[PDB]
Amino acid sequence: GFKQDIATIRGDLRTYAQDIFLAFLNKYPDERRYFKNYVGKSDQELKSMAKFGDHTEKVFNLMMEVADRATDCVPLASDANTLVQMKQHSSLTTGNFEKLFVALVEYMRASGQSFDSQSWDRFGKNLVSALSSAGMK
Amino acid sequence: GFKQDIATIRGDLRTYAQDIFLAFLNKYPDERRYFKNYVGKSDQELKSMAKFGDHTEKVFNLMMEVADRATDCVPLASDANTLVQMKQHSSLTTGNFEKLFVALVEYMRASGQSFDSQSWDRFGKNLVSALSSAGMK
Numbered sequence: 001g002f003k004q005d006i007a008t009i010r011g012d013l014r015t016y017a018q019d020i021f022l023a024f025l026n027k028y029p030d031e032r033r034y035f036k037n038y039v040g041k042s043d044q045e046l047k048s049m050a051k052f053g054d055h056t057e058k059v060f061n062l063m064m065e066v067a068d069r070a071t072d073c074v075p076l077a078s079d080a081n082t083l084v085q086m087k088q089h090s091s092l093t094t095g096n097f098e099k100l101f102v103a104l105v106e107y108m109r110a111s112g113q114s115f116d117s118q119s120w121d122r123f124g125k126n127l128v129s130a131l132s133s134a135g136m137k
Numbered sequence: 138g139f140k141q142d143i144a145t146i147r148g149d150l151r152t153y154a155q156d157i158f159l160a161f162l163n164k165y166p167d168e169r170r171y172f173k174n175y176v177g178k179s180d181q182e183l184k185s186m187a188k189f190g191d192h193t194e195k196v197f198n199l200m201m202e203v204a205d206r207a208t209d210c211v212p213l214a215s216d217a218n219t220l221v222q223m224k225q226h227s228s229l230t231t232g233n234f235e236k237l238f239v240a241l242v243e244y245m246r247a248s249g250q251s252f253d254s255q256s257w258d259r260f261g262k263n264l265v266s267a268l269s270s271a272g273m274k
């Protein structure tokens with residue numbers, strides 16, 4: 001289930017982090033306008049960039065702690081507040097988070113792993129709701 | 138589901154509040170000691186008393202609002218705080234609340250009306266956790 005999937009991702013975090021984030025950027029290529037130096041590059045050229053692996057692992061490090069601190073896929077309001085008040089997230093609306101979780105769930109449903117993809121969908125939805133309550137447009 | 142259940146209960150509140158509360162005291166008779174005006178009265182005698190109908194409805198009115206404000210059966214920390222810091226709940230421990238929800242779920246599973254009883258179980262567990270966090274021994 002959801003709690004298990006957390007441990008699964010954390011067991012091979014950078015690989016899942018890069019692969020899921022690549023799924024997101026390939027599903028929604030105009031999302032790359034929020035990042036610097038990601039455009040014009042294939043999967044293998046994002047992966048030999050130093051910052052891509054590092055930054056993206058940090059993203060999922062935090063995503064897994066937010067998931068881990070959740071109850072029944074409901075994230076802490078304090079975790080949503082952190083995500084909204086991060087300088088690096090100042091350009092975002094909740095719709096950017098919706099796209100990420102749509103791509104995440106799609107990735108899980110296509111993988112050869114026994115993920116609980118319905119829970120990740122509930123979690124993405126609950127996080128969007130929480131981001132709105134914490135004041136993200 | 139859980140949301141429909143709130144509407145079912147709200148629709149005929151005086152009746153559900155009294156029925157569930159009595160199912161609580163009858164399953165756990167020791168609990169009556171906390172409601173000193175109800176000691177030594179039959180089910181029918183309690184209904185003739187003004188503060189029984191009126192205080193029990195208010196009990197369940199609050200319960201329904203906590204339920205309505207929950208996400209996926211997870212109540213707000215602020216709502217758990219209110220229940221803890223109520224003059225009337227000063228002598229209580231989380232076990233008192235655990236007993237209420239056991240009786241409530243049992244009542245629901247025995248009824249003719251169709252209830253999402255596993256959700257009310259979940260809600261009870263989550264609320265007990267929130268009460269403990271908020272400082273209830």
Ligand code: HEM
Nearest residue numbers: 031034035036054055056058059062063088089096097100
């Ligand atoms: C639950 C979802 C998310 C979590 C936990 C998360 C977490 C993070 C973390 C930890 C960083 C800092 C990384 C570092 O400094 O190395 C970061 C940076 C950033 N995030 Fe996210 N993030 C999430 C969703 C998103 C989404 C959906 C977008 C846009 C589509 C986004 C845009 C950015 C940008 C533009 C930066 C700074 C630039 C960069 O690191 O290259 N965030 N976020």
Ligand code: HEM
Nearest residue numbers: 168171172191192195196197199200225226229233234237
């Ligand atoms: C989530 C479940 C509960 C909710 C929403 C709740 C809510 C309330 C509210 C709003 C009152 C004030 C009623 C009034 O003065 O009209 C109250 C009174 C009281 N409650 Fe709680 N309660 C809950 C569970 C419990 C439990 C588990 C016990 C102990 C077993 C308890 C014991 C009392 C007592 C002894 C009073 C005073 C009696 C009265 O004022 O009529 N309640 N309850």
